[PDB]
Design a protein around this ligand. Sequence first.
Ligand SMILES: O=c1nc2c(n3ccnc13)=Cc1c(-c3ccccc3)cccc1-2
Ligand SMILES: O=c1nc2c(n3ccnc13)=Cc1c(-c3ccccc3)cccc1-2
Ligand SMILES: O=c1nc2c(n3ccnc13)=Cc1c(-c3ccccc3)cccc1-2
Ligand SMILES: O=c1nc2c(n3ccnc13)=Cc1c(-c3ccccc3)cccc1-2
Lengths: 463, 467, 239, 464
Amino acid sequence: KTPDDVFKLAKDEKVEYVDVRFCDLPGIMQHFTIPASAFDKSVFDDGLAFDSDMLLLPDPETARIDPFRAAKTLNINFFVHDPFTLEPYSRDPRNIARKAENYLISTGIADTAYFGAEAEFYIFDSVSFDSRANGSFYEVDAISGWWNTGAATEADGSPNRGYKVRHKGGYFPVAPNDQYVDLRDKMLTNLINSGFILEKGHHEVGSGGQAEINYQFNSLLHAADDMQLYKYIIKNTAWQNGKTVTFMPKPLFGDNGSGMHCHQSLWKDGAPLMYDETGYAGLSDTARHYIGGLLHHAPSLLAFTNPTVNSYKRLVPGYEAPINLVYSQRNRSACVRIPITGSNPKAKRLEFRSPDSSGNPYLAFSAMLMAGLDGIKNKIEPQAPVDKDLYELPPEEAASIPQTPTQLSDVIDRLEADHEYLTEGGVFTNDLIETWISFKRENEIEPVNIRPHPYEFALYYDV
Amino acid sequence: EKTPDDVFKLAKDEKVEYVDVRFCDLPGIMQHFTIPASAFDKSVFDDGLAFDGHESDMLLLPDPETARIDPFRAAKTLNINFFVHDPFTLEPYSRDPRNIARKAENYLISTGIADTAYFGAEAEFYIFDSVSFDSRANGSFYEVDAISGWWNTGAATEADGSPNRGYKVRHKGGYFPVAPNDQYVDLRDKMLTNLINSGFILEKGHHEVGSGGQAEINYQFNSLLHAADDMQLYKYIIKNTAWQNGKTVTFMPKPLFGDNGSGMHCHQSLWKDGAPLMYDETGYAGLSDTARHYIGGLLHHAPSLLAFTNPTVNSYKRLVPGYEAPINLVYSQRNRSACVRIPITGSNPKAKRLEFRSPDSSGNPYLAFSAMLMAGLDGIKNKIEPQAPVDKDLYELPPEEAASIPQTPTQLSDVIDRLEADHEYLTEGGVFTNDLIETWISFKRENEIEPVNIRPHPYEFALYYDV
Amino acid sequence: DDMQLYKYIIKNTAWQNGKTVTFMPKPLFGDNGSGMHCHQSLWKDGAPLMYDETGYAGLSDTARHYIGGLLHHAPSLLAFTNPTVNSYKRLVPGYEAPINLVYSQRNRSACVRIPITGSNPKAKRLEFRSPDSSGNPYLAFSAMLMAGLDGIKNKIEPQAPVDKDLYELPPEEAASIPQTPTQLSDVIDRLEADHEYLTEGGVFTNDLIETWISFKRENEIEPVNIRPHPYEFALYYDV
Amino acid sequence: TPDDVFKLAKDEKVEYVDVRFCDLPGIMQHFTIPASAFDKSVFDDGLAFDGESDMLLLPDPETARIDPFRAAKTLNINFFVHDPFTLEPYSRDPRNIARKAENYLISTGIADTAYFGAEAEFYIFDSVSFDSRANGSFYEVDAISGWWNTGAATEADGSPNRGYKVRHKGGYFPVAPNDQYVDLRDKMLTNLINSGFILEKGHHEVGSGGQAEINYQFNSLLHAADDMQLYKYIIKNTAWQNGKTVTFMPKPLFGDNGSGMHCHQSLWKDGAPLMYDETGYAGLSDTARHYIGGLLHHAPSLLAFTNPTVNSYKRLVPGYEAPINLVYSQRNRSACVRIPITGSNPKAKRLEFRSPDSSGNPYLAFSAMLMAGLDGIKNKIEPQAPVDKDLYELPPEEAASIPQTPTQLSDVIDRLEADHEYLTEGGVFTNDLIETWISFKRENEIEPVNIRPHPYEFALYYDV
Ligand SMILES: O=c1nc2c(n3ccnc13)=Cc1c(-c3ccccc3)cccc1-2
Ligand SMILES: O=c1nc2c(n3ccnc13)=Cc1c(-c3ccccc3)cccc1-2
Ligand SMILES: O=c1nc2c(n3ccnc13)=Cc1c(-c3ccccc3)cccc1-2
Ligand SMILES: O=c1nc2c(n3ccnc13)=Cc1c(-c3ccccc3)cccc1-2
């Protein structure tokens, strides 16, 4: 969306520093700042050096004004390139994504992939945690937390006023029960100001400590950029107002997980490919195959989709979790749900409900698109839909319903075995997958695995 | 009433940035989500909004009447109450309290007895500074406190370190003393302002009254459904006025032991082709043939009716045999211990109504109001005659001459059984479904009656540890 | 007398070693209750009256009728047996507590369970499992025996014994088993209704029983009822 | 002999007798009866109780011990659970399972006695506290001697920090004052010798910082298991009585030693050892070889009984080289099975299974091991080549062919759920018992730990 446009923004707004941003492999953004003067034409054509060593080239589409910086700052995202060969670095997620958009163009099946994500998050007043030789602990807190019901007085001394208990009847009570109304307002304002579009099905929902704002869809790469931006604005708006946000799958035990339902659809020559009045749920064979690709590769898809150890405290056989490998229109417990849109072809999409916000959105959306394209290119048929509720059906008839693996170590094992569908088009390279597998095993899987669980003592000190 | 167009005017004049989509849960706690102002166009009134809570997905349709500017949100927010429909069939959801009241108001018309049922409810509440409580395996506790609480006469300093300045104790004489005994004057006025600015009408028999921690403000009547809408708004505004002044409110039936209960009195009337039915000098008190038959209906149905008018386990710490609590099934002109009570309307035709004295605010105003009107109508159908009025005292009149004055049931688990055993007048017209009531019977049993029943009371320790 | 003694000795041994004991039927929520399992037999001329091999579970025709008397008068018998408000926090439908008005040799869930004693005529007895130590052992034993006798005199035949599992037996097939009342106020109302098996022979007097009722109502039932439960705040402060 | 015990009860002026018996996962249960009530009729008729409904309890005279901790003079005896009507050993009493194993061992004519000796490590702390709430979870153990306390200004009781704490380079078993628990361990050893444990040549009290171990003489399978139970009871209580608190949990300390139970085994017939053969390896007959063959073959499921806790697998990890390598050796501490150097003496010859931990039920652990051992003989299962070189330092493609034990309790439970015939042979283990054990572990241990966030997850992921 034109270098010259970004230069207009720089002037109208009177920008004085530019925040160069880029994405580390496990998916936390990185930044440094240059003065506005040092940002010009030559930045877009040549790039910027930085440190091993990297050449950074900017994406004109991702330019945003920073609501939080005291100086007037414009943030832009960049693709990492190798300074010698000038060629897109292999393990830059923004590139893994860009190659995925381009692969989709070469197949000639469709030209654009539209992603839309619904990312939930927790708001807390404080968190502390710590692992030692002889002990370990964590504790999150918040004023409105139902476990603070018999509190003498609050954190800051002020009297305990009640209105905390997660009650019965609904999930989204009005104030004073809704104790973070004004915070979510600020967030939504900051999102609307930072150019997020909010139309029909888009809203701010708030269930006590947990909240969700959804915005309009976007093209795969830019959907992911939006997703990193959303997180950034949500986190910092809480930060700037004395709170602390976490997107982690399962911070509260015996309460709700924080999911990310991803809506995907394919378009070509300016028309939707997912609609067909005649087929089930109004789904065309292209869509049905795509779903079949997702359900076939789910076991290895979850490696990027739900890539933390914490992820599998949410995806656990119990809560009616999106772990059942079928598609549906009803079932919440099914992996792929289809949103009831109607006779409108433009809205017809499919919602993959397993993912969580803990992943790298660039690799996640890509991994999904790759799995779906595999479904299309191999005409895979998904096992028939399941519309009547799953909790009420014979134990044997419902034993034909396969499950997602329930551990990080497993999905990582599975990614290791079958990852062929990801190597297509030079998107995920066999190198990068080795790295993703090693990275998780060495830095997550096993360092968690060697540390005794607090609850283990409950069970076993007495033995 | 006001059309959709006025709502897009209000929003625009006020410079609303967000619109609050409110709908009611089954027990009667408002639910909401927020959408930007720009996303609130005319298609909202025609096509509706989607969201998801057997049911899964749901279509929500706005009520142009209930649009109000939130005084409390920092962002400029307009609130509108919605009806729940079937996304596919456009059919009202049989379990949506506002729908239920809608059905009630239509049914009334489908009988031709009248066209409009009016309600207006004086609802009482408590203001506290603090509340804490908690249930564990090896014990329980609760404690409300407030600065003006009489149990705090001996305090050395107040909570904020400030000296104790007296003027607390509940006295003998009257219930509504002036400052400084009335410590909650500025807060109550603030509440009043907020209700006035949020559009409530205060006129004749309408007042703000302050009895210690307990307080009450009564506002103008409204048609059954919109009366209940008003009822919600009223709680919201009190609650949130308190909250933003660092206090805490509660509408529960009995927060304090050995002290007053919080009670919601519902005045009913009926109207047709612009005129009131209830009036007629030639009969008792001013009551017409229909008015009396109505009253009969309330009285014959009370044991099941209470299941909606007096829902909570806490509802029956107010309604106790002794306190002169409205448990007696007769109508009256003088008795505060009587279920129905005809107010001194000074025989002008329009003001003739009847006040039900039993229900508390701890309910679902939609269902309550609806089920009340349902009882009153069945009473009109079978021309049901209510036992003779009682104008002489109940506290003092021969013990075996007034023995056959019947009593409402005094437990929750009791009244629910009456409901599970007789619910026809409610299902008449499909106003209440049988499916709805079955769940509300089950609610209630699982979620209220049973978990209370299985927890030891602290006082059981006073009684029994030593045994 | 032994029972009062036991209690006293238990309480005081603890008290003397810096602790504190309680026989209240349910002191901990979501944990076990303290019950009193009562074994009964009748004897004549130094020889037991309860044994018979050709009858069910080794019972005599005396023993069976006796049982019928307990189960028919249980709704009233509990007013002495389980005479406190706190008793019904133990005898609530849920924990599968001994509430089902049937007799067994298997069930932990029935009021009367016959102790497996095999072929010894002396050792055959009946264990009435509902009572708690919160009552008066004098009045409680008394009323058990009194109800047991009205069963022999009138020859009450108790419905079929159930060895089969009370936790899993078809929802409408076992919907034909009477429960005890689940509230003190109930068993009191039901003692006021029928208490004839008690005043037979002038053992319990109509007066005594009338005091007991007024004692339980005005000193226990009513003062608990008018006092708000902490869990009510958990339920309703928000309304 | 029954009569020994009555004279024991008499001589020691015993006033109470402790009726003991083993629950399913492995903690002993008890009720006390007066000494007056304990007579000839106990050993003949039995004793009645309930846990299913009513059960009969029959005493094992061998297990009779004076209780050194109870102030009232008390005698502890273990019992076997029987059905009151049929007089049938109960299908589920671990002590019966051990008994029944010992008999099946005779029924095959393979050997008549199965000898088990156990070296069970333990930890001594001054305090433990923990809990798991909705918004939080924690644990902490502490010991004044602990190397994390080097910088403490004062101790718990206020007296000054005197040093001599930190795990130091070169030595695992230092002398005092580094050995801060010398007088406690002594009391422990005294209490065992007093309680009828036998200590001889290879038997010794060792003490590694806060971890400690005391071996005692072998016994026949059932009694070995009884001893193990007893050994735990005395260790635990000896500390308890001295204001300390002990744990047999496999892995209480992150970044430190795990506690293991090494299980020495051998078989005998007609009073002749079956394990020796001067024709190698390590002087091992084919009986001994096939036994090992079975151990190593069934190890993937055997661990659901030898290492049956979620904690067990924080010790058994591909880390410090914990005994997870499916080979037998003479050198590697990282081998599952190892043969102790006995040299020429044919009676000392045995095989040491090194994976097990004391978080177990020894009756089941020991039975499961022997059952696996016999299937090894009956099927002449041949175990893969004995590794005598280093496991941590060898060509990666020649060490890739070395199989590993499963790394997680969830797995071994499943592996047990797949093949477990070798256990059900002769009716030692019933399919009924094994099933309960699976449901038990899955629903009570595997599933509850799983759904509870780990504190280090907040370290990794709060910032995601
Ligand atoms: O006009 C459009 N309308 C829609 C759209 N789209 C992509 C390109 N042009 C359009 C995409 C779209 C979705 C959608 C599709 C996939 C993922 C998320 C949202 C839902 C409702 C309506 C639309
Ligand atoms: O002019 C009126 N004046 C009154 C009225 N009403 C309904 C329609 N028009 C009127 C209704 C009304 C009540 C009333 C009726 C029912 C419930 C509560 C108040 C009391 C006093 C005065 C009025
Ligand atoms: O030898 C006797 N053995 C018993 C007995 N009894 C009464 C008079 N003589 C005897 C009474 C008795 C009971 C028993 C009977 C009723 C209530 C409680 C215990 C239980 C077991 C054994 C006996
Ligand atoms: O004389 C013996 N010497 C020994 C023995 N044993 C059992 C029966 N008789 C003997 C068993 C034994 C072991 C041994 C065997 C298995 C497990 C632990 C120790 C070690 C050294 C010496 C012996």
